[PDB]
Structure formats: C-alpha cells, structure tokens
Enzyme design. Structure first.
Site, PDB file in Angstrom:
ATOM      1  N   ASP A   1      -5.656 -33.788   6.717  1.00 48.07           N
ATOM      2  CA  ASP A   1      -6.799 -33.907   5.822  1.00 48.07           C
ATOM      3  C   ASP A   1      -7.499 -32.560   5.681  1.00 48.07           C
ATOM      4  OD1 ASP A   1      -8.905 -34.702   4.261  1.00 48.07           O
ATOM      5  OD2 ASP A   1      -9.815 -36.027   5.752  1.00 48.07           O
TER       6      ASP A   1
ATOM      7  N   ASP B   1      -9.470 -45.418   0.236  1.00 48.99           N
ATOM      8  CA  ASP B   1      -8.721 -44.701  -0.791  1.00 48.99           C
ATOM      9  C   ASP B   1      -8.212 -45.643  -1.874  1.00 48.99           C
ATOM     10  OD1 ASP B   1      -9.187 -42.358   0.549  1.00 48.99           O
ATOM     11  OD2 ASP B   1      -7.206 -42.259   1.490  1.00 48.99           O
TER      12      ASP B   1
END
Lengths: 505, 484, 518
Positions: free
Chosen positions: B44, B364
């Site tokens: 990430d 998400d």
C-alpha cells in the site's frame, strides 16, 4: 561565460589602463619591467597596450585592431580604445540581462550608427570658405605632381581639367565618379572635359540615336545562345530538329520576365550578354531599349551617379530602385562608336577624355592622374572640423533617442544602450580633468535635449559654456574614424562566442 | 530559483520511482523499520508514505494526495504517485529549454480537463438500474482477497446498500455513515443488513438486565451513573432522581459514552431499571458519538437538565441476537424521514485475521460502486486508458502553437509509464508488451473483458486530476525558508 | 555494457555542443590560436574540428569523417555533427528502456530511406522551370556564405567567376569535379576588386633578366605558344668520383674555355626544331645562362615547385620533354599567349597566362588587403564550387534552411503509426531527432525554438504543403520560395547518409582500450 568575461572584464581591466589617459589633462601610467631599470613613462595609449605582455587571448585581438587606425590615419588612437571599452560596458549589461546571441544586438548598433553620422553632417562646418585662395593652391600643387610624367608637356591645360573635376563634384571624392575614356590616334592637347557617362561600342542597329527620359535597370540574363556546353549530356531524340526546340522552350519561359520589364515603366533595359532577335524585336513594340557591353565597373559607376541599384534577379515586380537620364546622344569620334548619357537627376560626375599616340602613353597618364587627384581630394576631408567640447558627442546621443521611438521589442535595449555609451565620453573627460561627471553631464543633456543648444564642455571655468565663443573645434575626419573603428572593434569581440586560451610563452 | 525546484523534483522522483516498483500485487514491496523497532510489510502506497517520516516538505504532499485518492476514488494510490513522478521527470528538460513553469502548470490543468472527455467517449454507457454489472463489479474486485466462494454472497449485499443511498443527484455520499463492526466468532455466511443502526459493543451481562425491549427511544447521553463523588439509602436516593427524570421522557435506551474517568452504571441502579425494563448499553466509543448523531437524528446531551423528549429517537424493536462470542444488538425501523437510513453490516468470523482483512476488502468494494454514482461507466484497466489517451494526442499535438505544443508531446509520453510498470512487474518485457498493445489498437480498442478485470472511470479520472494540481503546486514554491 | 553507453553519449554531446552556436550565417565565430602563434577566426566547422588534438576515442570519429565531407560536399561539417548528436540523445533514452543498440542503429537506416522517397514527390525542377533561373542560382550561391563579411559588397564580381570555372573542369557525362584540378592561390596585399578569372595556371615569374620582353612573339604565325618543362638537374659536369676542378693560372684561361661551350651547341639545335618558346625548371639558373637564349627570344623560368607543374601541363596541354632528339611538334602544347600584368601596387609584378580554349583545369585567383580576408575567401569559394556540381548532377532540389528538416519530421512521424513492432518507436525518436536542426537554427537566430517549430508545422498541414524554413539572417518575410533560395537535394541527401553512418559507428563500439604514455 568566461569566454565573454575574458573579452569584457579582461578587456575593461586593460581598457581602463589607457582610459584615464584620454586628453591632455588625463592621468599617467608607469610601465615597469623585471629589472625595473629599463622602465619609461609616457602618455601614449597604444604604447602601453602593446608593451604590457598579456596572456589573455581576447586582449591580443584588440591590439591588432588598434593598428588599423595608426596605418589608415594615425590620429586619435587612444580615443578608439577608450570608446571601444565603453561599448563593452553597455554590451555586458545587455548580455547578462538577456543571455541571447549578441549578433542581434550588433544589428542594432548598425542602425544606430547611421543616425549618428547623419547628425554630424548637418552641424558640420568647414574651412572651404574663400575658395578663391584654395583654388589657386590646387592648380599649383597639381603641376608639381606632373613632374617626371609625360603629362608635363602642358601643365596649364591638364591642371585646369582637374580643377573643375574636384570643386564641381559637391560630394564623394572617390574615383568612381570620374570616368576615364582613352582613344588612339590623337593629341594630348585636344583633351576636353565632359560631365556625361560615356560608353563605347554603340548598342543596336535600327534603334534610334536619340532617347528622351530614359530609365536604367540592372539585370543579368542570357537571352541568346543558351546551353553553352551540351557535351556529355545524353541526347535521345527522334529527329534533329527537336534539339533546337528545347532551347526555344527554355527561352519561352523568359517571356514572363520580359513582360515584367515593361511593367516597370522603363524604356531601356541593360544586359551584359546578347539577346536573340525574337525577344529583341518585341522590345520595339514595347518601347524597350537594349544596352550591351555594360561590363561590371561601368555598371556600378552608373547606378551610383543615377541613384540606382544592381541586382541579378527579380525579387518582385514594381519594387526596385531606378535611375533616369533625360537625353542620350550617340556620336562617333576617332573611328570608334561612342555613347553619351546626360540629364541625370542630381547627377554628379565628370569624364576626362585623353587622346594618346600609343598604348604606353595611355597607361602612364591614367595612373599619374589618379595619384594627382588623390592628393588634391585629400584636402577635402582635411582641415574640415566640427564644433567640439562635448557638443557633437551629445548630438550623437540625442540622435539615437530618435531611433528609440520606433524600434522592435527586443532591439530597444540594444539601441538605447548605444546612446549611454556615447554619454560616457564626457563622464571620462570630467573625471580626468578633476570635475564632477554627474553634475556636468546632467546639465549638458537637459539643455541639448530640445533645440537651440550651442553649449559645450568648458574645462577652464568648470561649467557648461558655449564652445563657439571660445573657439573649440575638432576635426570631422577624426569623428568618423573613431566611430567606424570602435563599431568594427566591438563586432569582433561579440561575434566570438567561445575564446580558447592562447598558448603561454 | 531552480536550485530549490530541481532539488525537490529529484528528491520527489526518487520517492516516486521507489513506490513505482510496488505497483500491482506482483510489485516489489518496500520495508520501513521504525526507530521503536516496528517493521511493516505491504504494497500500500498510503501506508508506506505515512510511516516513512519524510523530512522533505514537498514530498509530504503525496500523503495528502494519496489520502484523497482513497477517499474519493478508492483505488490507485500507487498509480497516482507514479503519474506525479512521471510529469516531474519530463519537466527536467523543460527547464533547460527556458520554459517558464506557468505554461507548464497551466497546460497540465488544461490537459486534465480534455482527457476526461476523451475517456468518456471511449467508455461504455451503463446505468445503475441494471444489477448485472453491479454484482460482477464487486465479485471480481474480491479476487485479490482470501475470500473466494463467500465473495459471491457478499456481492448483492454491497449493491443493494449503495443503490438505496445513491438516489440520483446526491452525487458524493459520505462514507462515514458506513461502519463495519467486526467481532470474533460466527462466520461470513451469517449477514444482517440492519438498516436502522448497529453499535460497536454488547449489552449489560449482569443479572436483572432485560437486554431486550420493544418500542423504545434511543438518544445520546453524556451522563454517567455513579455514587456521590465530590449510606446505602443515601446513594440509592441520589440514583432515584436520575432514573425518575429519564422516565419522564420514556427513554428505555441509555447510551453512555465510554470514559476511563468514572464507571458507567452502578449495580444498585440495575435493580431500579429492571422494573421499568430500560436497556442500557455502555462502552460507547468517542468515534461513534458523531455517527449516532447522524442516522438517528439525535443530539448529544451533556447534563441531566439538557435531556428532553424531543431529542430522543425511535426504535421499533431492540433485541440482543444470541451468537457465539458475538451478542450483537440490532435496531430496526428508526422511522426517520429526513435523514437517510445508515448502512452498518456486522462482520463475523472465527479467526481474528478474517474479520480484519474482510472489513478492508469491503471498503474498496463500496468505493468502486460509489464511483458509478458520481459518473457512470467503467474502463478496463491494464494500460488501456493510458495508451488510448496517447493515441488521440498524437494528431492533436500538431494543432497547437507555441510552447504549449511541445507539452502535449511530453504529456502523452509520461502516461506510458503506468502500462510499462504493469508489464515489468509481471516479468514480461516492458517495451515488447507495449508495442503489441499499440499494434492491435488499429482494430481493437478496449480489448481483458474475458478475464473479468474491470476498473471504474473515477480512478483513472481522479488520478490525472490530482496529479495535475500536485505538480502544479510543486513549481509554485521557488524558495524554502525557516519560519518559527 | 554499463558505463560505456552512458559515457559515449555525454562525451560526444559536449564536443558537438561547441559548434552548435556557429551553425548558420548568424552563427557566432570563434578565436583559434595556432601553435605557431597565429590567431585565426572563421565560421567554418572544418577548421575548428581539424585543429582539435585530443585523446578521447569518441571524438576522433568527427575528425576522420570531416576530411571526406569537404571533398564530397563541404557544407556537411557543422550540420552533420549537430544532427549526429541528436540521434545519440534520442538513443540514450532507449538504452534505459531496454532497447538493443543495433536495433537503434538499424532503425535509423530504415527511417532514412523512407524519408528520401517523401522528398522525391515534393521536390521541384530547375531546368524545367527555365534555363536562366539555373544560372541565377550560381550567382547567389556564394552570396549567402559571403553575406556576413565585407566581401558581400563586391559579391557581384565573384559570382561570375564560378560559373565558367566549373563548366570547363566538369563534363556533363560523369558530372564530377576534381579537387586536384582546382588551383587555389592567394597572397597578402591589394584589394578584392582586382580578382580575375583565369582559364589556366598563373605561374608567377619575373622573366629573369629584365631585357626579356613581357610578351611572347608568335614566331612567324606559329601555332599557339609552346613551352618546355625540364625536371632534370641541369647543372655542371659533376662526376661520380673525382670532381676537384680548379684553375691553376692564366695559362688555363683558353685551354678550358673552348673545350666546354662547344657541347651545348649541339643540343640547342634540337630545341629550335620543336619551337619551344620558354624553358621551365625546378631549381634556379645562373646569371650568364639566360643571355644566349635572349638573342633567340627564348625566356627561361626558374624556382618552380613540384606541385605547380601539374596545372601547367594540363591547362596549356604541354608535357615534360625526356630527350630533345626524338621530340616532335605533335604533342607540344599551344596556348593563346603569355604576358605580364601588374596587379595593384604590389612590386612582385605577376603575370597572366591565358588559353581561349576549354581546358581540363582552372586556377582560382583571390586577393585581399588582409591575410585573414584571403583565407576566408578561399574556403568560401571551395564550398561554392561544390554546390554547382550538385545542381548539375541532380536537377531536382528542395528548399533547405529549416524547411527540409520539418518536412522529413512530419513524414516519418506520420508513417510511424502504420509501422508496428519495435521500429515504431525507432521512427518516433528519429523524427524527434530531425527537429533538433530547425530548433538549433531557431536558437542560433535568437528566437523561441519551440514557438517557431510549432509555426512551421502548422503552415505545412492546415494551409497547404510547402517549404518554409527558419531565417537566421534578417529577411523581408517568410516563404523563401519567393526569394528563390535553393539548396541542393543530393547535397542534403549526402548529409543524412553520413549522419546515420556516423551514429552507427559510435553505438557499435562498446569498449574503449588505450595504452599509456612513456
């Protein structure tokens, strides 16, 4: 950047050495050697620059440039270096604030230098007054040159022709305004003076011998017998007659250029080569005259006296610089065809026709005539002076400000900085004389700014006074010599982007 | 001034090139060892830039861009950093040619607006009324997570939750109203929408608590039940007037904010509230104070005098669901016409690592569906939108004039960095794969459709918009001074 | 394989960046200092690159290539080096992307061949337009290179000298001009207005003893003027062993006198039969040696170099007589006449040997008031003679000065999308490399290189296809076609071929090996 810094900071450091020596009240400098017992003191600017060894390769270029002023004239050598150093001070401020190639800035100096020379002409005076005393001395000096020359047979007749060939010019003294026509089977005493431009080998057969209001155009083309060398080119044709057809097709395209000749409003066309019968026959209906055997020299001398130009191509119709002559007379003398051009607008020129008995007497008379006229015409630019004392120096400054009105965007600072360098001359003279440069120049420019300003730099009273009352004048030849030398000197350093370090000895 | 900008561009390019290797699941992961000894590992970009402790002032702007990238689009936090560094790398030669950054900055904003219309013309127009593309969008997005067979069961749960709160002109929808409560126990197969509200904790496990009540009022109360704190009957007398004022407004649900200062509910007050069947839920987190004030339409009440009936909500049935290690309380039928119903789904599972990654995976999935709410349509990823823009800018660059004409040529070259990195991280040759994509471009356009790989249009749109203003603000600072 | 590819790009770029500012007529000059202490300033890149002495193995290819460019074209000195640096800068970005270097070298060859066919459709014809328009190109050919110098005032005189000189030395069959057939000679002093076009060798001579006439007699209507050159060491009787000749006393005055002179009396009869007017030798002559040849009107020439004898035999059709016995009059050369013509005020008193017939060689005559003006005029005339050869060899020409590079850029970039594969990016980098020349000319002209390049591309697409270049020197307006400014197509075609050949040799060398100095 060090390439320009060596030509700027390195040149200014060397230029400031002789800068304080400008004028009789300027500073002095000692030149010391290694042993120190061989030294000397002098005020000469050219001696200090050449004697001091300098490893700077840009400083050696200025030495060779200063040698041109000494050989050509030899006066004001220090003023050339001082003025050239001030041009680098303004050019350095234009570069660092731009970082663009100086060649564009160089173009701005050429346009500004033209206005400076025109401003000095209107305010120029001369000692030519009382020409009666100068004319009597001109004929006496010419008779001295005739010694040892075959022209010494009769001094009065030959010197009289040269007298009216100088004072009647009222313009440039170059020999390009004097035409030399020489023939065989004649006497030297029969020579006469003529103000017309005389040719030989008269043009045309059926063309008329009298032409009124004739125009002059300069061009280079071959209208007759093209394709000089045909050998080596592969020829594939079915018949032999097709070979001449190709030459007619090439000359057929010339009709467009011939049609543009009649559109110029000219009755006469000048060409160096010959012309075929077909384009020559069309010249009769269109009223076009064909002059031949113009050579090269005679072409340049004719365009200057008639106010024309020379070009070998056509850039665009109805745009050109043309001359004119009122009357053209065609006569014949000495069993040779002659031509006569007269009636030119503002025409200033003369022609001396010398009749010799052989070819040896003609070459000796022409070379002896140029040496005699060069000495007499030298006094035209000699003794002629202008108003000095910083006046004429400021006149060139305000003349550049006129060009600063209409100017390009990026060319404004190039022209404006040239006027600042012209105002550096009174700044240097005020510092060397012990006065205040900021106080004198400020009051000097405000008065000369608009009109009715006779004031100048007065070093006796330390203020601004009229130089016409004190009688302070400087030669006009020195003005043009320094400006033309300093302008070319600055171009040499600017046109060089990179300067390689010279080999140390 | 270039010494300040060029030093910041090179420093930011090394950071962007380092994050560039982390693009995709096969990318190179970056390790950061904190001074305390903690070591984190992940791909990430938002986590790496946050824990890196960058001392470069301009390079810290990527954290704010990556934060807005996940908050708006929800994807492309690594790709937006690559596109930012791509424009900075191409800007090195722009300063050498004497180009002022204003033209460089203004051209990025003008090209970002024109790049949106190019993608919309090539995008396929879809509508939210069709549930065929909505279920397959969330199902394929979960292929990157441990869940596989259970991903198809949670697909219709996320679709029906967004379509109710999306409406039409609402456009952006606040994501704070979506709270996923995770608890150990249970499984993924057990799911309950519970549109009314869901709390983060259980109820009172002591004796006498009803734990279930029907037709009750819910409201925020910052008070706390404690004995006098500047004998048995004295403490009960002080607690009698507290429960009596609550009975005046008929409030059967007491929510006490969690505080370590004092206790929550005294044991003596449990017997008093047991007769009136008043349910009490303690240990309310501070983050839930603002959450409960939105969907329920209530107001926080600091003192006992501020407590009124008009600030109390409505709850049809409040009960505690019996489950292993869960004990979740649900509320249904809040009956609030003005405020939209909140969406809170309870996530259950045996392992602690399940309910953790599952909560992040559903975040998400809701963002991609929310991208269709603002702008409908989707563009398949894998370098398709990056190359398609460069194809149209080839002939358009010749129609410009001046300094801006050269920027359009370098703008299309910087967009090729994204598909090039995707080919490198997969082991394939960089240039060889890109040439094969441009070769078939004469026939095929968007063709990845058979592989069930889909990407929303907002991710590709926001990545260009955020990177345009980012680089624009970088060149605005020409000097750095110390100010304290 | 690692630092070699990166170092060769930066090394070749720093060397090529020196002459980038000198490209074009506005390009700035440079100050070069010879090791002998002479300072030279010129705008030609061939002089700058030749004076470079360096141990860098990459920059050595620029000197070896520039030697062959002067004979073939001569204008590809600065232009090719700048264009070659553009191909190396575009190739540096491909190295970091993983592109193979030979694919970059092979990609430039295929891209250059496609761009040549594009200009073949857009080129224009000279001879098909008109015959006299071709000669106007020869008159203005030297005007462009000399426009930045003081010579630009008299340029009209030097324009007609190159028209008749090339036609004589070059035949329309092969259409080639030899460098050895052009004699370039100049001296210090005089002016530039006295320069004349001579159809034969100059051969400056003082005619030895002053009693000899300055003109050659026709010798009773004889054909032309015959000359005799002798490279033999014509000299006293030096044996191979003894020597040792001395005069003892006056008694030997008449003994050794009549024994010597009776020899040459036999050989002088063979010279009069052939009719040789003048005798030329390599070394000097005695004082009394030319006196007996004076009564026969037979002048003699001494102090002539070995290279000067080449232009004497070719122009005058003469030879060098091995032996006087079998010498005949068949192969003896015949010219118009030989006379002495003083040039300016110089006391050297040079002479002129004319022909009046077409020869195989010419002699360039250049004068000037400064040593630098003479050297700058000789090199500018060399490039002007090569342009005339290119116009005759190829009638189809294109408009240069920035118009050709933009046209070649849009042609390769448009065809890049139609050609897939690895060569797709090789065509894009080649098209962007061609944009360096018009941007360099725009930077050398003091204008925005990007703002000007975008203008030239817009006028050739939305309006119509034409040739519009960047003006380095201030002119009236754009569209050089109106000003009749033409450039040879084969001359520009030779530049792009040598540029790709030079770029390949740089990339094909991945290793640098050099020993030390002891």
């Amino acid at each position: 950047e060090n390439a320009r810094l060596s030509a700027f900071v390195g040149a200014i450091a060397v230029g400031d050495l002789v800068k304080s020596t400008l004028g009789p009240k300027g500073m002095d400098k000692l030149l010391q050697s290694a042993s120190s017992n061989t030294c000397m003191v002098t005020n000469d600017g050219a001696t200090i620059l050449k004697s001091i060894p300098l490893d700077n390769p840009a400083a050696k270029v200025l030495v060779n440039i200063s040698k041109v002023q000494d050989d050509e004239v030899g006066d004001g050598t220090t003023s050339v270096t001082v003025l050239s150093a001030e041009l680098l001070r303004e050019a350095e401020k234009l570069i660092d604030q731009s970082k663009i190639h100086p060649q564009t800035i160089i173009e701005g100096y050429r346009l500004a230098s033209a206005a400076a020379l025109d401003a000095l002409t209107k305010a120029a005076v001369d000692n030519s007054h009382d020409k009666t005393m100068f004319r009597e001395d001109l004929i006496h000096i010419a008779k001295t040159t005739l010694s040892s020359k075959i022209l010494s047979q009769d001094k009065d007749h030959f010197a009289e022709l040269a007298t009216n060939a100088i004072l009647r010019l009222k313009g440039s003294t170059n020999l390009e305004h004097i035409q030399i026509i020489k023939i065989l089977g004649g006497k030297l005493s029969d020579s006469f003076l003529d103000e017309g431009f005389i040719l030989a080998k008269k043009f045309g057969n059926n063309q008329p011998k009298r032409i009124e209001n004739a125009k002059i155009l300069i061009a280079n083309t071959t209208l007759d017998t093209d394709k000089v060398k045909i050998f080596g080119t592969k020829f594939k044709v079915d018949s032999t007659a097709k070979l001449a057809q190709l030459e007619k097709a090439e000359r057929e395209k010339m009709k467009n250029k011939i049609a543009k000749i009649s559109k110029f409003g000219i009755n006469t066309f000048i060409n160096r080569q010959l012309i075929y019968d077909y384009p020559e026959q069309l010249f009769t209906d269109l009223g076009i005259n064909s002059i031949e055997h113009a050579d090269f020299e005679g072409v340049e001398r004719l365009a200057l006296v008639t106010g024309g130009e020379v070009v070998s191509t056509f850039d665009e119709p109805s745009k050109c610089k043309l001359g004119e002559c009122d009357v053209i007379e065609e006569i014949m003398l000495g069993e040779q065809p002659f031509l006569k051009f007269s009636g030119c607008k503002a025409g200033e020129a003369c022609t001396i026709v010398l009749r010799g008995a052989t070819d040896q007497t003609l070459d000796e008379a022409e070379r002896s005539l140029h040496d005699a006229l060069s000495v007499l015409s030298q006094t035209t630019k000699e003794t002629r002076t202008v108003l000095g004392g910083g006046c004429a120096e400021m006149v060139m400054s305000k003349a550049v400000d006129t060009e600063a009105q209409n100017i390009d965007g990026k060319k404004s600072l190039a022209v404006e900085a040239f006027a600042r360098a012209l105002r550096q001359l009174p700044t240097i003279l005020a510092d060397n004389a012990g006065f205040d440069s900021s106080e004198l120049v400020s009051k000097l420019r405000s008065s000369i700014y608009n009109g009715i300003s006779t004031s100048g730099l007065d070093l006796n009273n330390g203020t601004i006074a009229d130089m016409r009352q004190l009688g302070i004048v400087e030669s006009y030849k020195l003005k043009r010599a320094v400006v033309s030398s300093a302008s070319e000197a600055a171009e040499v350093l600017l046109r060089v982007d990179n300067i390689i370090r010279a080999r140390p000895r | 001034p270039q010494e300040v900008r060029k030093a910041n561009i090179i420093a930011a390019r090394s950071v962007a090139d380092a994050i560039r290797t982390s693009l995709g699941p096969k990318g190179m992961d970056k390790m950061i060892k904190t001074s305390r000894g903690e070591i984190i590992i992940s791909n990430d970009g938002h986590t790496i830039l946050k824990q890196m402790a960058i001392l470069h002032p301009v390079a810290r702007m990527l954290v704010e861009v990556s934060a807005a990238q996940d908050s708006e689009a929800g994807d492309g936090t690594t790709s937006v950093v690559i596109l930012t560094g791509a424009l900075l790398g191409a800007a090195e030669r722009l300063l050498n040619k004497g180009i002022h950054p204003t033209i460089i900055a203004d051209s990025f904003q003008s090209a970002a607006k024109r790049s949106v219309d190019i993608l919309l013309e090539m995008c396929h127009k879809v509508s939210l009324s069709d549930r065929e593309q909505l279920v397959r969008a969330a199902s394929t997005s979960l292929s990157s997570k441990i869940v596989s067979q259970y991903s198809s069961f949670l697909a219709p749960l996320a679709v029906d939750s967004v379509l109710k709160i999306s409406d039409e002109n609402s456009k952006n929808v606040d994501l704070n109203d979506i709270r996923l409560v995770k608890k150990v126990g249970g499984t993924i197969d057990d799911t309950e929408m519970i549109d009314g509200v869901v709390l983060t904790q259980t109820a009172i496990k002591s004796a006498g608590g009803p734990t279930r009540k029907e037709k009750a009022k819910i409201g925020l109360i910052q008070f706390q039940i404690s004995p006098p704190k500047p004998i048995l009957k004295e403490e009960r007398a002080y607690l009698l007037n507290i429960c009596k004022k609550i009975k005046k407004a008929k409030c059967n649900v007491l929510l006490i904010q969690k505080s370590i200062l004092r206790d929550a509910v005294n044991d003596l007050a449990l017997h008093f509230l047991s007769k009136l069947n008043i349910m009490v839920v303690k240990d309310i987190e501070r983050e839930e104070i603002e959450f409960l004030s939105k969907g329920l339409g209530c107001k926080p009440i600091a003192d006992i005098e501020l407590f009124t009936e008009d600030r109390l909500g409505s709850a049809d049935l409040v009960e505690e669901i019996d489950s292993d290690g869960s004990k979740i309380v649900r509320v249904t039928g809040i009956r609030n016409n003005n405020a939209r119903p909140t969406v809170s789904v309870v996530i259950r599972g045996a392992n602690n690592m399940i309910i953790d990654e599952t909560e992040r995976s559903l975040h998400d999935a809701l963002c991609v569906i929310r991208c269709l709410v603002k702008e409908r349509g989707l563009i398949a990823g894998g370098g398709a939108p990056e190359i398609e823009i460069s194809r149209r800018l080839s002939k358009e660059a010749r129609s410009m004039e001046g300094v801006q004409a050269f920027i359009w040529q370098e703008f299309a070259s910087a967009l090729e960095v994204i598909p090039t990195t995707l080919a490198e991280n997969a082991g394939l040759n960089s240039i060889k794969v890109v040439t094969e994509l441009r070769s078939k471009h004469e026939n095929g356009e968007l063709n990845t459709y058979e592989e069930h790989i889909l990407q929303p249009v907002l991710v590709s749109t926001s990545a260009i918009t955020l990177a345009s203003e980012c680089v624009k603000s970088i060149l605005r600072i020409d000097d750095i001074a110390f100010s304290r | 394989g690692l630092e070699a590819k990166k170092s060769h790009i930066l090394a070749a770029r720093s060397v090529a960046s020196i002459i980038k500012t000198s490209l074009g007529p506005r390009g700035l000059d440079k100050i070069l200092i010879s090791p002998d202490g002479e300072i030279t300033i010129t705008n030609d890149g061939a002089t700058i690159l030749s004076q470079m002495e360096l141990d860098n193995e990459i920059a050595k290819l620029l000197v070896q290539l520039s030697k062959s460019q002067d004979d073939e074209i001569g204008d590809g000195t600065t232009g090719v080096v700048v264009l070659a640096s553009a191909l190396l800068d575009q190739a540096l970005e491909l190295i970091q992307k993983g592109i193979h270097p030979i694919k970059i070298a092979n990609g430039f060859d295929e891209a250059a061949k496609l761009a040549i066919s594009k200009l073949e459709e857009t080129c224009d014809d000279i001879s098909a337009s008109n015959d006299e328009l071709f000669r106007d190109f020869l008159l203005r050919a030297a005007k462009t290179s000399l426009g930045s110098k003081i010579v630009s005032k008299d340029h009209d005189r030097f324009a007609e000298m190159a028209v008749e000189a090339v036609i004589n030395v070059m035949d329309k069959d092969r259409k080639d001009v030899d460098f050895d057939l052009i004699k370039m000679q100049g001296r210090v002093g005089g002016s530039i207005s006295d320069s004349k076009l001579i159809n034969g060798v100059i051969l400056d001579k003082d005619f030895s003893h002053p009693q000899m006439p300055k003109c050659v007699l026709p010798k009773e209507g004889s054909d032309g003027v015959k000359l005799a050159i002798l490279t033999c060491p014509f000299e006293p009787p030096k044996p191979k062993t003894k020597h040792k000749l001395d005069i003892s006393s006056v008694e030997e005055y008449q003994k050794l006198q009549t024994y010597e002179q009776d020899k040459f009396k036999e050989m002088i009869d063979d010279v009069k039969k052939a009719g040789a007017d003048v005798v030329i030798c390599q070394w000097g002559f005695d004082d009394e040696a030319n006196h007996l040849l004076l009564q026969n009107d037979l002048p003699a020439v001494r102090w002539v170099g070995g290279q000067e004898l080449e232009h004497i035999a070719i122009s005058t059709n003469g030879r060098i007589v091995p032996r006087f016995q079998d010498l005949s009059k068949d192969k003896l050369g015949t010219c118009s006449r030989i006379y002495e013509q003083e040039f300016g005020t110089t006391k050297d008193r040079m002479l002129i040997i004319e022909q009046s017939k077409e020869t195989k060689t010419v002699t360039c005559f250049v004068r000037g008031s400064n040593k630098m003006i003479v050297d700058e005029a000789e090199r500018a005339l060399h490039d002007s003679l090569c342009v005339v050869r290119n116009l005759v060899k190829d009638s189809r020409v294109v408009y240069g000065g920035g118009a050709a590079e933009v046209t070649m850029s849009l042609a390769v970039s448009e065809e890049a999308d139609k050609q897939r594969g690895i060569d797709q990016y090789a065509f894009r980098g080649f098209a962007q490399a061609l944009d360096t020349i018009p941007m360099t000319l725009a930077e050398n002209s003091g204008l925005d290189p990007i703002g000007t390049l975008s203008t030239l591309k817009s006028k050739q697409l939305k309006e119509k296809i034409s040739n519009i270049g960047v003006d380095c020197l201030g002119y009236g307006s754009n569209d050089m076609k109106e000003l009749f400014v033409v450039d040879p197509f084969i001359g520009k075609k030779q530049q792009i071929l040598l540029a790709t050949q030079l770029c390949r040799m740089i990339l094909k060398i991945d290793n640098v090996i050099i020993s030390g100095k002891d």
